[PDB]
Amino acid sequence: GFKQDIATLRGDLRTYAQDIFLAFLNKYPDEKRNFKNYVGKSDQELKSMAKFGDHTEKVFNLMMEVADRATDCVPLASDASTLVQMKQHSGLTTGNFEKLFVALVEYMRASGQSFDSQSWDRFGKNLVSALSSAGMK
């Protein structure tokens, strides 16, 4: 289930973090409006860009903590408030999060592994609801 999936992702987190973020950028290329330095790069070129690797790992490190602190895929209100109030998120709306979770779930469904894709779909929807209640547009 969901808690085992957190353990699976954490066991290879740099690889999962990069491949999920690339699945997102490749599914929604207009999302590079928020990542202008990632334009005109293949996946292999992005992986060899220092900030791409370091920011994607730090995003997925925190995402796994938010997932781990969740009850039945419902994140803590404190984690939603933190995500809304981060200066690095000043540009964002809940639709950016929705797209990330649509890409993550499709990535999981395409994997050979027994990921609980329906729990990740719930988690993404519940995080979006929590972000809106914490003040994200």
Ligand X SMILES: Cc1cc(Cl)ccc1O
CA dist., res. 79 & res. 131, Å (int): 9
Residue 114 neighbours by CB under 8 Å, 6+ apart:
none
Residue 67 neighbours by CB under 8 Å, 6+ apart:
2, 6, 75, 123
Q: Which does 62 bind (CB under 5 to 8 A by kind): ligand HEM, ligand X, none?
A: ligand HEM
Residues lying near ligand HEM in the complex (CB under 6 A): 31, 34, 51, 54-55, 58-59, 62-63, 66, 83, 88-89, 92, 96-97, 100, 127
Q: Which does 56 bind (CB under 5 to 8 A by kind): ligand HEM, ligand X, none?
A: ligand X
User: Residue 71's beta-bridge partner residues?
Assistant: 74
Q: Which does 92 bind (CB under 5 to 8 A by kind): ligand X, ligand HEM, none?
A: ligand HEM
Residue 17 Cβ vs ligand X, minimum distance, rounded to whole Å: 7
Torsion angles phi and psi, residue 132, rounded to 5 = -65, -45
- Which residue do the tokens 């995402």 mark? 63
* Residue stretches of the annotated binding site for heme b: 36-37, 51, 55, 58, 88-89, 97
Closest CB to ligand HEM among residues 40, 112: 40
CB 38 within 8 A of CB 52: yes
Closest CB to ligand X among residues 16, 21: 21
Residue 59 Cβ vs ligand X, minimum distance, rounded to whole Å: 4
CA dist., res. 130 & res. 69, Å (int): 14
Residues lying near ligand X in the complex (CB under 6 A): 21, 55-56, 59, 100
What is residue 39's three-state secondary structure? coil
Residue 45 Cβ vs ligand HEM, minimum distance, rounded to whole Å: 16
